[PDB]
């Protein structure tokens, strides 16, 4: 169960980074002063957002850009909680055994 939930989350995270990159540019163009407006740097912004690093070099200023950002965040965080929970499950079993 756990590994499949984790693997799926990883696949789902990759999809969210790419879709999030596309949707962030769509949301932010048309807002004066917005910088999250070209796709290559938007993919970079989605990665530093999903990992929760959040340098501050780029960020959304619109309502829809910010909603996209929160989905990226939660997708990243969730994937990591799942990988962590999966590692714990693995270890717990190998330790029962040892």
């Amino acid at each position, epitope marked *: 169960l756990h590994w499949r939930a984790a693997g799926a989350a990883t696949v789902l995270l990759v999809i969210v980074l790419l879709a999030g990159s596309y949707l962030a540019v*769509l949301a932010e*163009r*048309g807002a*004066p002063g917005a910088q999250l407006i070209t796709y290559p740097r938007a993919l970079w912004w989605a990665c530093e957002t999903a990992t929760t690093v959040x340098y501050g070099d780029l960020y959304p200023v619109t309502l829809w850009g910010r909603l996209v950002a929160v989905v990226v965040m939660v997708a990243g965080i969730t994937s990591f909680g799942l990988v962590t929970a999966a590692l714990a499950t693995w270890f717990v079993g190998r330790e029962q055994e040892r």
Partner: antibody
Amino acid sequence: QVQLQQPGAELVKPGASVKLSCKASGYTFTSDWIHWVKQRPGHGLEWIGEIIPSYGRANYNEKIQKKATLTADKSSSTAFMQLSSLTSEDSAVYYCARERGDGYFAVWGAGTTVTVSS
Amino acid sequence: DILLTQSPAILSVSPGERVSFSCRASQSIGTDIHWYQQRTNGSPRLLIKYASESISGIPSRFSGSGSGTDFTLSINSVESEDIANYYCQQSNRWPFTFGSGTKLEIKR
């Protein structure tokens, strides 16, 4: 082959409207945006607006009076700019240009010379 | 919105000389500047992207430099075909904007 094809000219009476076209060929991606640029004789390049065909959303220059409405047809790979209620101030060459979502205009159409006159 | 100032508006050089066009942004825009050449009755043509990156098909004669607010387009050894108007354009913040253009004149 020519990536963006535009008609050479359009004559428009003051107050009437006209719909300019820009037919695209070559590689097309979901990240493409088509932009329109206005250039009056002897003057510089003025950005009018952009549209992303894959989604149909358009943004416009807020600094100028809005004369344009952008649309795009996916099946005919054609982008359109509807100019309305024109005056002589609208007489100029209007170019369409393609941007691959990375900020620069890789290719430009030949431009449509629009003359507003009776 | 970002203002791009191109000055002087007219540059006159002698054949074969190195010339440089200036583009100054009203605020720092990284290297998000692109340059276009527009010959008389022609449409604009991209020459350099992201301040210094080459474009295939463009003579090696052209190059770009700078970052922040000050950018330069240089032509090593100008020749007649370089006669044209040159424009810079930024893509750092929405909306994209263009400089007012510099015309290259050759003194033969």
